[PDB]
Amino acid sequence: SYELTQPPSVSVSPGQTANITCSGDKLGDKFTSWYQQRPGQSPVLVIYQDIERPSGIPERFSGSNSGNTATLTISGTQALDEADYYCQAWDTSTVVFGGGTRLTVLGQPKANPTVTLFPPSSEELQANKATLVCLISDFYPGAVTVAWKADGSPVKAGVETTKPSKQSNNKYAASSYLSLTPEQWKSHRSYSCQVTHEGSTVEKTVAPTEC
Amino acid sequence: GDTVAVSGKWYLKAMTADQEVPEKPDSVTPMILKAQKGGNLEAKITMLTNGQCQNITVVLHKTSEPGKYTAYEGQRVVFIQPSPVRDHYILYSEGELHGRQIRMAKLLGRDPEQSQEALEDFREFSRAKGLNQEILELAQSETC
Amino acid sequence: QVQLVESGGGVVQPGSSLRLSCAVSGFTVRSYGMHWVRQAPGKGLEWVALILFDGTTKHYADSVKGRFTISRDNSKDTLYLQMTSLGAEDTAMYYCVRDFNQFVKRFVDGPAFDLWGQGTRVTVSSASTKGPSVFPLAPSSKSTSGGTAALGCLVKDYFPEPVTVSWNSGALTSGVHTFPAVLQSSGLYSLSSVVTVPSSSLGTQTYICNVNHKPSNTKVDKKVEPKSCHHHHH
Ligand SMILES: *[C@@H]1O[C@H](CO)[C@@H](O)[C@H](O)[C@H]1NC(C)=O
């Protein structure tokens, strides 16, 4: 129902002011809360009633809410500010979280992902299964969105995506796997794996082009 | 500021009026007040009259005066104000109610148990505000 | 202390039932609107259910309607979540939280969750020790003409961890990337291992992946051969 919309990621250099937005229909008519979540740990409340701050939370954190947009502003961003941020509001009998935003505070040169899409193998196909394999390598920041398409329209059915992990190069890797029925693989003209990193898209596509 | 101060759970403990007591209820539930964005108060109460549970919901629209609110499409002014007694408030109200002008007052507390101290203060205020001076206390249950 | 502690997670079979507990310290549990919030690995927060301080008012996510009821025992300072008919979509970390803006002495139309427990993990899978299925990811016929080329092994539907993957009985290590496993909604793991090799060798050098799965005593050595097919033109 009521949807709160967050850019998936944001990155800034230490000292830079980070902005983080959350959109929803007439969101300015509600009270928005914000939560911070560092890896392996419980969310922490950083803003409530749009602008108010619990004690324990530094002044560099502040909030506003106008029209359809609530904004979390982090001035003079610190390294430890690196976390996932979530907006929340109350609609009707429902509490709603936005999808979250990975703020990275840059500690590395940025590195674009290389993307490798393998089609299903004949041996897999002979066993009546079908996996498209999409390998994402050597990227920083370590935050990626993956969208699988079929002929050009989206597909959320049989998708499994790992969480970014750190490699030796201190750069990140993820995997995504699209499980489909040999029938669907034959039926469509092409499948695409679409990775998006720092607001830019790499898309490899694949078709049944085997003898 | 004060909309958040009077937000939460209250017991409606005493009521009086300048006119007569119409379907004046057997038992009331706790009165819940929710502070809404922009400064309005959503008051909800259930009451038992003649075997029926009437749920009541009144929005208190904020004016520019501290403690002054409108309801019932601006026909009824409601004045909110603390008791001298800890954990008590008084709601004074005038304007039309349901066809007839009925100047009214209400006594709120955080705790159900009647304070003879709060009730005096109520009796003072009410009489000064003009009243039948017939302080009516109210029976209390948690559900209806 | 002023804290929330959850317990009662663990691994269950699809369709089954589980009760989660939330031991409060530092306040009275019936004075506050209390909620459950979950998050599946690598995903965002999903609100599940709520009970107001009135103890009677209850709201759930369209996702769990029917299947779940929330409750509390003030005398044990414990909030409860009863979960039925569990499906894989219910796998997650589960948190109790306190809405400090829903309080007998402060009620604002703006939920704000100051308290959070550390979480209790719930896993709904029938997964049991299973050996992997190993499939060659053969190099593209376009990357076969020149440059380097990418080939691999897809190691699929195994349980549990770990899986070892080497190439050519360990003799080939350059340009090797064995990607971390994925853990599917099925509760099984699949991993892929990829090598970048010169296309010139494709014809001469044969590429075998060495997959070991100690838990299932399964070891597979998969030849990954280039398949050659001229298809679409214009
Ligand atoms: C973030 O928000 C402020 C306040 O509206 C805006 O003026 C500023 O441009 C933003 N900061 C940057 C540079 O991202």
Which residue in chain C has the smallest CA separation from A57? C114
Q: Whose CA is nearest to atom 1 of ligand 1?
A: A19
In DSSP notation, B73-119 reads: TTTEEEEEEE-SSTTEEEEEEEEBSSSSB--EEEEEESSSS--HHHH
Q: What CATH number was assigned to the domain covering residues C133-224? A: 2.60.40.10
What distance in Å separates residue B70's CA from the closest CA in chain A?
20
Q: Which two tokens stand for residue A90?
A: 């109350």
CATH-assigned architecture of domain B8-140:
Beta Barrel (2.40)
Q: Whose CA is nearest to atom 4 of ligand 1?
A: A73
Which residues of C are less than 8 Å from A133 in CB distance?
Answer: 137, 152, 154, 192
Question: Can you say whether residue C52 is alpha, beta or left, with left for phi > 0 and alpha for psi between -120 and 50 degrees?
Answer: beta
Is any atom of ligand 1 closer than 6 Å to the C-beta of A64? no
B18 touches chain C (CB under 8 A): no
Q: Let me know if the fold of A9-105 is the same as that of A114-206.
A: yes
Q: How far apart are the C-alpha atoms of C221 and C223, rounded to whole Å?
A: 7
Q: Whose CA is nearest to atom 6 of ligand 1?
A: A19
Counting beta carbons within 10 angstroms of the beta carbon of residue A3, is it exposed (0 to 12), middle (13 to 18) or buried (19 or more)? exposed
Q: How far apart are the C-alpha atoms of C20 and C22, rounded to whole Å?
A: 7
Sign of CA dihedral A186, A188, A189, A191: negative
CB C109 to CB A90 under 8 A?
Answer: yes
Q: Which residues of C141-169 are buried (b: 16+ CB within 10 A; e: fewer)?
A: bebbeeeebbbbbbbbbbbbeebebbbee
Query: B129: which residues sit within 8 A by CB, 6+ positions away?
Result: B92, B103, B105
Extents of the domains making up chain A: 9-105, 114-206
Q: Which two tokens stand for residue B17?
A: 């009026």
What distance in Å separates residue C39's CA from the closest CA in chain B?
29
* Cβ contacts from B onto C, under 8 A: 31
Please, what's the largest Cα pairwise distance for chain B?
Answer: 40
Residue to mutate, A17, A66, A72, ligand 1, most ligand atoms under 8 Å from C-beta: A17
Q: Which CATH number fits domain A9-105: 3.40.50.300, 3.40.50.11540, 3.30.365.10, 2.60.40.10?
A: 2.60.40.10
SS (H, E, C) chain A: CCCCECCCEEEECCCCCEEEEEECCCHHHCCCEEEEECCCCCCEEEEECCCECCCCCCCCEEEEEECCEEEEEECCCCHHHCEEEEEEEECCCCEEECCCEEEEECCCCCECCEEEEECCCHHHHHCCCCEEEEEEEEEECCCCEEEEEECCEEECCCEEECCCEECCCCCEEEEEEEECCHHHHHHCCCEEEEEEECCEEEEEEECCCCC
Which residues of B are less than 8 Å from C105 in CB distance?
Answer: 8-9, 110
Is any atom of ligand 1 closer than 6 Å to the C-beta of A66? no
* Cα–ligand 1 centroid distance for A55 (angstroms): 24
CATH-assigned architecture of domain C3-124:
Sandwich (2.60)
Q: Which two tokens stand for residue B42?
A: 């959503």
Counting beta carbons within 10 angstroms of the beta carbon of residue C108, is it exposed (0 to 12), middle (13 to 18) or buried (19 or more)? buried
Q: How far apart are the C-alpha atoms of B72 and B67, rounded to whole Å?
A: 17
Is any atom of ligand 1 closer than 6 Å to the C-beta of A19? yes
Which residue in chain A has the smallest CA separation from C43? A99
- For residue A18, the ligand 1 atom closest to its alpha carbon is 14
* Cα–ligand 1 centroid distance for A18 (angstroms): 8
Nearest to A64 by CA among A56, A53, A55: A53
CB B36 to CB C109 under 8 A?
Answer: yes
What distance in Å separates residue A30's CA from the closest CA in chain B?
6
Extents of the domains making up chain C: 3-124, 133-224
* CB-closest option in C46, C135, C194 to A123: C135
DSSP state of C196: E
Q: Whose CA is nearest to atom 12 of ligand 1?
A: A17
Q: Which CATH number fits domain A114-206: 1.10.1510.10, 3.30.300.90, 2.60.40.10, 3.40.50.300?
A: 2.60.40.10
Q: Within 10 Å of residue C176's Cβ, how many Cβ atoms? A: 16
* Cα–ligand 1 centroid distance for A108 (angstroms): 23
What distance in Å separates residue B42's CA from the closest CA in chain A?
15
Method: X-ray
Is any atom of ligand 1 closer than 6 Å to the C-beta of A17? yes
Residues facing C47 on adjacent strands: C37
Q: How far apart are the C-alpha atoms of C228 and C139, rounded to whole Å?
A: 9
